[PDB]
Structure 1
């Protein structure tokens, strides 16, 4: 429900240049929740459809293809595939997967909302990488609208401008 600190971390990894206001963070935090709900729900119906007791990374991946607009989908799938692949060859979970967002908190969230009987680990890693990639994407576009306008602080107007002036962001967050 609160990815704030991790959102702020993500922002500084690419643009220490840029700050973000309270309103902007809560709005951006709500987008993370909405995207989580819609992905978990779709994976939930997919698990039931394929007679699965457990939501695995496979259900997460398919759910990502369906919910996300064209280009965002292929990049999210690539990132989710990267986080799970790195964590496997490496045998915290976030660190092993190379993620900044809390893999443990997401798994738990997935787990206490009863989308399935069980939530596999690789699936929680997959979803976490997707939430992080998307969050960075919004921050990048919300940040570009701020920096292009010669400002150094993301305000709510910039989020609206980023989502509006971008087609795929528009399909998803519109």
Structure 2
């Protein structure tokens, strides 16, 4: 059975292990549970972003998640806002008209 299946994760445990070997150590070893933990973390973060974006898309009544929805969901949640400080192509801005105006 696949290492992802044994770990109960949809992400590739073997490929993530290979990437960790080829990108993360000078000359040394990568533990087998290192790949499992990394894949679980990636799965969790992606699942959270996907759930928030899907909620936004459903609020906007559309069946496809688009960069506008991703931007809305990312800026909406405080933790995701602090974790992701990047620019999203075709994402727009969140409306905010100042009171003094």
Matched, 1:119 2:30: yes
Query: How far apart in 2 are the matches of 1:142 and 1:100?
Result: 19
Query: How far apart in 1 are the matches of 2:54 and 2:84?
Result: 16
In structure 2, the gaps of 5 or more residues are 86-101
Cα distance, 1:115 vs structure 2 = 2.6
In structure 1, the gaps of 5 or more residues are 1-91
- Matching residue within 142, 156, 161 for 2:72: 161
Query: How far apart in 2 are the matches of 1:148 and 1:118?
Result: 47
Q: Secondary structure at the match of 1:151?
A: coil
Q: Secondary structure at the match of 1:125?
A: helix
TM-score under structure 2 length normalisation:
0.78
Aligned-residue CA RMSD in angstroms? 1.0
Partner of 1:133: 44
Cα distance, 1:114 vs structure 2 = 3.5
Partner of 1:151: 62
Q: Secondary structure at the match of 2:11?
A: coil
